[PDB]
Amino acid sequence: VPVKLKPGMDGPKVKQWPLTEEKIKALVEICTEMEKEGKISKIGPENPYNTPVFAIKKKDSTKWRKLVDFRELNKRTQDFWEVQLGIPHPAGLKKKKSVTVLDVGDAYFSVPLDEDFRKYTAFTIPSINNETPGIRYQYNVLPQGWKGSPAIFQSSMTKILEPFKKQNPDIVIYQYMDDLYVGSDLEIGQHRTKIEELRQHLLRWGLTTPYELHPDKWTVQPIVLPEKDSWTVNDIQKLVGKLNWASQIYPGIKVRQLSKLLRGTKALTEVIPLTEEAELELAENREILKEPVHGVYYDPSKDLIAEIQKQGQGQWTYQIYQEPFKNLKTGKYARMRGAHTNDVKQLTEAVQKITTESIVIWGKTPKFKLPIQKETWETWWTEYWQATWIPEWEFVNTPPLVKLWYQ
Amino acid sequence: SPIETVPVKLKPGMDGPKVKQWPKIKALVEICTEMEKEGKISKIGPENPYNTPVFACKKKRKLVDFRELNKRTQDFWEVQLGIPHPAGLKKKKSVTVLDVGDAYFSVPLDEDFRKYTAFTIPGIRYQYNVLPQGWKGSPAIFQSSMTKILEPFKKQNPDIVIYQYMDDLYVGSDLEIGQHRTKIEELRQHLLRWGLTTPDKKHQKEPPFLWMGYELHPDKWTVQPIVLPEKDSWTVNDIQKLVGKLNWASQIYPGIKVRQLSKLLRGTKALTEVIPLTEEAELELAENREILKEPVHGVYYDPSKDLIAEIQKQGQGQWTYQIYQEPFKNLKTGKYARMRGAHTNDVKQLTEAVQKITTESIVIWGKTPKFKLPIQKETWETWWTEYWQATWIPEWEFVNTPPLVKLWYQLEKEPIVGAETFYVDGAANRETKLGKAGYVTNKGRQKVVPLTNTTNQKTELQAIYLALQDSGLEVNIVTNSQYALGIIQAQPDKSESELVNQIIEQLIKKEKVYLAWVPAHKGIGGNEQVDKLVSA
DNA sequence: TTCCCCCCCTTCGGTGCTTTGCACCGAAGGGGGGG
């Protein structure tokens, strides 16, 4: 199956980051067995392309899996993935009841790769203390992580799934990267056995194949206003500021009666009694905020940007949007397991949850805007990652002083 | 003799270089004839008009000009990702350093590319039948051929450890030295089978061994003697050399500071002007020399133990770490003086240094050390919980030795009862580049000062400055500028701008400060008055 | 008529907002280590 780049772009030339000794000596013992059976073949200096590679541990299975950073090769061969053949997103998967995630990456280890293209899929296993130059490799069969591989294997996977899909059309099947989302309306007790049956059916096709996510629980959270009888001058100032900041996202927001309520240069602490006109205005504002935002629509041509804020006490907020100040979705994440362990962890599972939500709902990973310094992220994001995909991210430096989602 | 060729091509769209022919003819060919005796150089006819600028030196030496061919040769991946460091070498019982000679002259170049590396001495036109010296692809191709040759031997002998770095082999073993000489003999025989002329006894070494500024003794290591120049009239070039030498010597010498030595380099025009030193730079250089006066040594690695990377603060954005495995027996010593960002405090610099040490140690040894930071756990908790980023430090203990890093001032979270409230604002015209900064308190007191060559952000910070000047111990400043509040919220210690520095100097003295932001040009209490004042 | 690898500081330009100043990051110039 011929594969081609987008004309006018150089191939992937990304450098390999240093790795822990455990990861390096697991990568070596995986790559040896991969090379023995023809999956990867060594290469010499003449190949000028390289992509990162690092070892993760999925679901703490005590074993090691190999990820190859393909975020640039995909950006180059997006034509082979979005023009040649890309599976459309099933619009009914947004409203489903329960979805399970499976991996069919090993099923991609049989299709031979394009003879000319292999030289682009080269990676390098480093060495501790630079003892020996990094052992290079290139792929001979379809790689697990490159968006060209689902495009090539789409027809084969569809032919695999046709019997099970025809027998059970109720479940909805989606495929992103080498991961499969299976969405059932059955009961929780029988859904697991049905998924085991699907796995056995996949096995019966000669391809080996190795979680009960519930999409329906994902709803846009409403932004809230404070409410108390004794409104101090400082709190009224904060409320006016929040109304001003929300005036962009909600056109109907009006803050005028509270502006007339603050005329004199009064102290921030002394209690200023709030009249009935301002009470009516607050009630009307809360009535407006009761309704969802109006005017947001999804355009597949544009790209998704997901912004993350940290509210402290192990709480994070995320906003997925395409056009600024019009959030396509808002949320909040909270887990006490990370805080007992780490803090970059909390962010890592936050990113995984957001990207899984966006794949299930929209059908593509967002571009993240992490609230973390680049060095402390690139150093530690590999110790907790467990999803075979890697979304694009950019790092922010200006503090988001607004933080009015949770005041 | 036989080494398998490697495909080599050129960047698409052009042929090889062709520089004008140059008009030695017999005396220099005698040297080249010896190369033609072995087969390093071949005979090229007139059907290969490609040419390169010839050049001959007198060795104390064909330094061929390849720059056009070097430019148009295809991209070769740089597999050498670093440099071996002595601190990561496991203590070996027997060692032997082999320096492979005639390295680039014994690797055959691909027949297709041979015609491009031409040479003109008029007749007879030369071409490099082997890997040229100074060519782009020579290092990578030679290193990969060396790896391909050496892999079977390493598979045969697992206990032998061989470090390769370009054209040099370093072999170590837990075997007895009598058996180690034997094993070196089979290594040499295997290498010579492939045509590499490894020395037998001429360049083989016994302890101490020598490498790049690295004296390696049987159970230690050190840098080769760093002689710091002594002179009375220092130009910028001597300062640059000093800084480089001190940076190199800091790998094992503890307590090195080069910030004030480098600060003299700022503002210089050319590479010849003489910059007189200050008292700070002179004192720092004298201290560096007088700590460099005695010999210090490192130690080798030992996988049976755990690394411990202490950190100390040497004052005003300088940190030092001493990675070690046994107390008072260092493995490595460093320094972190890089200051990124125009507004940071000490905890941010400490966590930056921690990440740097983590990545260096992952590069060198393979596992992250167990830090001993000079910061109290409660201070780290206070910093990381109430901050808007995701800061982590891997695993650490506390070092109770001053100077100690801590947060300086704590902005209050809620408005404070009974204390004064100031409403500050500044405004600067875009064109005239002149403005005014002022404030209105709750008591109706209003104070304003014109300012020259200060923009909106500058005059807002000066309004903060006046508010902090004229208030008491406790105060509530209310602003309408996001930039000012952002600068003051991050709790900086020092800043490149002096205005932020004096603002921090006042925030240190104040007992309790609270800052609240209100929108601008929207009529919120005292904003109307403090904007009317600056609207005149 | 020397090619690169790697580290450190300093200056310049791009870049995105904070919006026309200001604060980031990377890429270039000196040094160091030689291979």
Ligand SMILES: Cn1c(Cn2ccc(C(F)(F)F)c(Oc3cc(Cl)cc(C#N)c3)c2=O)n[nH]c1=O
């Ligand atoms: C001195 N020494 C030691 C230390 N040691 C341990 C292993 C190796 C190995 F063969 F692996 F390269 C050594 O060879 C090297 C490696 C490098 Cl980067 C530079 C130089 C130089 N000049 C020599 C080595 O020096 N252990 N026991 C003892 O006496």
